[PDB]
Amino acid sequence: PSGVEGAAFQSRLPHDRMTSQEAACFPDIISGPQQTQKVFLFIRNRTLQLWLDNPKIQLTFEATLQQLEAPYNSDTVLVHRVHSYLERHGLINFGIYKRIKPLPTKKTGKVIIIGSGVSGLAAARQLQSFGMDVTLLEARDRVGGRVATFRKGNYVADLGAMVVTGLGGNPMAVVSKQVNMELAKIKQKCPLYEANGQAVPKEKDEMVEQEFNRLLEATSYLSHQLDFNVLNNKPVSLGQALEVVIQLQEKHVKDEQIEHWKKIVKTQEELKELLNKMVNLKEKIKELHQQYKEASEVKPPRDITAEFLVKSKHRDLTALCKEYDELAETQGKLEEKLQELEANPPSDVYLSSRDRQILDWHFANLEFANATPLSTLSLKHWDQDDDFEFTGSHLTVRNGYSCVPVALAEGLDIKLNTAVRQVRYTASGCEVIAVNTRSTSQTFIYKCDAVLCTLPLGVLKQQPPAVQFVPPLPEWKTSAVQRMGFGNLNKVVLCFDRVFWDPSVNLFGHVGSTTASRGELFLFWNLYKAPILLALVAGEAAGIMENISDDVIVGRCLAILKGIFGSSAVPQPKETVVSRWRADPWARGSYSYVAAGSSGNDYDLMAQPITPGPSIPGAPQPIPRLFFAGEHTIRNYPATVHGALLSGLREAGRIADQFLGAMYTL
Amino acid sequence: ARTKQTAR
Amino acid sequence: RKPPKGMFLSQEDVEAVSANATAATTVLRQLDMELVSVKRQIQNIKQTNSALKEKLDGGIEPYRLPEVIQKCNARWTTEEQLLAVQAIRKYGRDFQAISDVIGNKSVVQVKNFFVNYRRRFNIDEVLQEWEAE
Ligand SMILES: Cc1cc2c(cc1C)N(C[C@H](O)[C@H](O)[C@H](O)COP(=O)(O)OP(=O)(O)OC[C@H]1O[C@@H](n3cnc4c(N)ncnc43)[C@H](O)[C@@H]1O)c1[nH]c(=O)[nH]c(=O)c1N2C=O
Numbered sequence: 001p002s003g004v005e006g007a008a009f010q011s012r013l014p015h016d017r018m019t020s021q022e023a024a025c026f027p028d029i030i031s032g033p034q035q036t037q038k039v040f041l042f043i044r045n046r047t048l049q050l051w052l053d054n055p056k057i058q059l060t061f062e063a064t065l066q067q068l069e070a071p072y073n074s075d076t077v078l079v080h081r082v083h084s085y086l087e088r089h090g091l092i093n094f095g096i097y098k099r100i101k102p103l104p105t106k107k108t109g110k111v112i113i114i115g116s117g118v119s120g121l122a123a124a125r126q127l128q129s130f131g132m133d134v135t136l137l138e139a140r141d142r143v144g145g146r147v148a149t150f151r152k153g154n155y156v157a158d159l160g161a162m163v164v165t166g167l168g169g170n171p172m173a174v175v176s177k178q179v180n181m182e183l184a185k186i187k188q189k190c191p192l193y194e195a196n197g198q199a200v201p202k203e204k205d206e207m208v209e210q211e212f213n214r215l216l217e218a219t220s221y222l223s224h225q226l227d228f229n230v231l232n233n234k235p236v237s238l239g240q241a242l243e244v245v246i247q248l249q250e251k252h253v254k255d256e257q258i259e260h261w262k263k264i265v266k267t268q269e270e271l272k273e274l275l276n277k278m279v280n281l282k283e284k285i286k287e288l289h290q291q292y293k294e295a296s297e298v299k300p301p302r303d304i305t306a307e308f309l310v311k312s313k314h315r316d317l318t319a320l321c322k323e324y325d326e327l328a329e330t331q332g333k334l335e336e337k338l339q340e341l342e343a344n345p346p347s348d349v350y351l352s353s354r355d356r357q358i359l360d361w362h363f364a365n366l367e368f369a370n371a372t373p374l375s376t377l378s379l380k381h382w383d384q385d386d387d388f389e390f391t392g393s394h395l396t397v398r399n400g401y402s403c404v405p406v407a408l409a410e411g412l413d414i415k416l417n418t419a420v421r422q423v424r425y426t427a428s429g430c431e432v433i434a435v436n437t438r439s440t441s442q443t444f445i446y447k448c449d450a451v452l453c454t455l456p457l458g459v460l461k462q463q464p465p466a467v468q469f470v471p472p473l474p475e476w477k478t479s480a481v482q483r484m485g486f487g488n489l490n491k492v493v494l495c496f497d498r499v500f501w502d503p504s505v506n507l508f509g510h511v512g513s514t515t516a517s518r519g520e521l522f523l524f525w526n527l528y529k530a531p532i533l534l535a536l537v538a539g540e541a542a543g544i545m546e547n548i549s550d551d552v553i554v555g556r557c558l559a560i561l562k563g564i565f566g567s568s569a570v571p572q573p574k575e576t577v578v579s580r581w582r583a584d585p586w587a588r589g590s591y592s593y594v595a596a597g598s599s600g601n602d603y604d605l606m607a608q609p610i611t612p613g614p615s616i617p618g619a620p621q622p623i624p625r626l627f628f629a630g631e632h633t634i635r636n637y638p639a640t641v642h643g644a645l646l647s648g649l650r651e652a653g654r655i656a657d658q659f660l661g662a663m664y665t666l
Numbered sequence: 667a668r669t670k671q672t673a674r
Numbered sequence: 675r676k677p678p679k680g681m682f683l684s685q686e687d688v689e690a691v692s693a694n695a696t697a698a699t700t701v702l703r704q705l706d707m708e709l710v711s712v713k714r715q716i717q718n719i720k721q722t723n724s725a726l727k728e729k730l731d732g733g734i735e736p737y738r739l740p741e742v743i744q745k746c747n748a749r750w751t752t753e754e755q756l757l758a759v760q761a762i763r764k765y766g767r768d769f770q771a772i773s774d775v776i777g778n779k780s781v782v783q784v785k786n787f788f789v790n791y792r793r794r795f796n797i798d799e800v801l802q803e804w805e806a807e
Binding site: 163165166186188190365366368369370377382383385386389391392393394507592593594638639 | 667668669670671672673674
Binding site for chain 3: 214215217218221222225226228231243244245247248249250251252254255257258261262264265268269271272275276278279282285286289292304305307308311312314315317318319321324328
């Protein structure tokens, strides 16, 4: 889409309709005349288009009105109400951008942000953008959180997220214009190579993918059309629904074969019964013909009974002879209906070992996409957010996805090597106790009005607790925390010094010996200018390969590589880096998923902020003091970098509304 | 979650 | 609203694979053994039906007699009449076979012959006796 309707779409917003969250800020317009609404939508929409057209500089109210046209630029209070609404919820003036109206001399309010992960920096810049006092506490010695880029010499490779899942409606699209980062399109063609070292033929390769895609749809049928979502009081996982689908089809192969072979025995019994009638016809013919020859011996002139018995036997024998030919002609038809059936038997097996070994690889990829074994994804919900997909090609960063978080950190107050370890939120404010990672003796106390918590769900999940909440989080929260899934996925970075792969191929897969290792080093990427190959460990392989030394993982990687490229063409790598996100204390995992028994409505529970109890009994219910952002708090966009950033934007909006007041809801 | 490296 | 073409997913199948974890392996095993039983069963009738095909070699070519190419005449020779009366006793109302035995009388003037000579040759007594068998 283009025009002002494109600005709405590029902002994840219906152009022709007013959102739940615009209704709450503009209830007068929602219940008003359908014409004022349309006014509003165009009054809105337009504004986003100006922001998008030049996102490197602040979009001030004055400029917006100046470029709005009659009759829209009349009700200035509406344009004020709109431009304030957007700026506040970070649909405009978010990211880098030169500031037309430099920041206020005196700040109001004090928020501590836990973690300078991408969500963290997003809120921070926004809150600071809003005249607030922001301080970010990072346990690491670098920013970016799960956005981690490895740079040595000219080698560059992300250990963290490395793809921009399409610019259609992507806020990263705005950031790209702002922070120049080299985005490279990813050629989707991917050829698989079995363990033997030989490429799978296209006919099998196309044949297998379609079955996998068909199989997925099948599960959806089970879920939505047959209410297959509980089983012995437990919730059905996608993995369970895949086996039961494959099983039902295997069964159906056997069902077809039994029908085909039963058709055979039906004919053979007819044929065998038909033969019996032909023997017992022939022997009747044998016997008569004797009688005829015997009766014929009486020589003429014979009296007429003897003459009858000659002619009489002749009719009988011929009569039985025309029978036996009809029978040997029904024979003829059934003896070919039997080579027809042998000529057209059904399929031997639904799937052979080679097939299931390639179909493993397609499941490995699905486990990579969800960072978890398919036996954990909820059947009903694992793809709840599979509707807000961005459009366009997926892309990589050629210069390290680490540049984005580093760009965001510019001019913010970040305490590095600062491990928050206890959060105390009270009616009158909060204090955060953090220690020093380098030296754990050194203790720090941080007092503030609100605390924004971008702690990964893995860190949030840990027993015993990496971080103490006093008072404890309420059960409605903690139980949402156990229900959700935090998955794992790891990468191996192979740093060579010759280029020996098909350079025109970004990605190519390795097929596993077994279902159990379907994720083990199953896929490689040539994304980087330098000679760098990068290899994935997903599914059940993921958590296991963390118990194995680099040199073993690297050795296995080279072996798969040698078998596919020739044992001579594969040098030793000059640098090697293996990731351990599950092991990592500041992540305890990779990103999240919708575990069996969860739903996208846990992701909403995660975002609801906590309002603490009254200090003195009978005191009025206070302000909410603790809030939550990061990848696991945004329902329509979990487990991405853009999703985490949007949650940051979200809370900065929510924070500011609570402590700076909303002056746009009149 | 859902499925990556594709434009659907 | 219907599963992808080729997928076979009916309600009844699906309970039966999930009653317990083992059930899915079981049902498949029954179909394997059940399929094998038909294959064993075939190769008997395939063998037995091979036995009978051998007992029927040569066909019946040696036991055949040539064709009686005989223009149908009208008048009734006294043998043609006497052949007839025995034919009725041994055949009943099967006019074709009775018209074969005689050979030059077609099936209508068989029927006509029963009419005109019914009193003269005491027919019905013959038929009564023919039924008695
Ligand atoms: C291996 C891999 C690959 C991909 C992706 C992810 C991964 C892992 N992800 C997900 C994002 O990485 C993640 O959701 C986001 O970074 C959240 O980002 P987020 O929501 O900000 O989580 P964070 O870890 O960045 O922020 C948490 C911060 O909190 C800090 N911290 C923790 N405990 C602390 C404490 N006690 N005190 C102080 N600080 C503490 C921690 O060090 C970190 O800085 C992708 N996303 C995307 O868009 N494209 C992609 O290709 C990918 N990718 C591959 O496909």
